[PDB]
């Protein structure tokens, strides 16, 4: 929620980014 630059989440990028934002100690299947 800041002037952050959109990262091109191509392939695995989406996955790692998803884990980063949603939460590491939880993506025990959704990643």
């Amino acid at each position: 929620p800041t002037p952050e630059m959109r990262e091109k989440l191509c392939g695995h990028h989406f996955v790692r980014a998803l884990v980063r934002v949603c939460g590491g100690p939880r993506w025990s299947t959704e990643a």
């Binding site: 952050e4 959109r6 990262e7 392939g11 989406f14 980014a17």
Partner: peptide, 26 residues
């Protein structure tokens, strides 16, 4: 640009933390 697919959308255009947060589930 536009894309009826988040993974594709994030790849083609790109996604931030906010963008991803909006896609975060329970």
């Amino acid at each position: 640009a536009a894309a009826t697919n988040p993974a594709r959308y994030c790849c083609l255009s790109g996604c931030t933390q906010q963008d991803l947060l909006t896609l975060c589930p329970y």
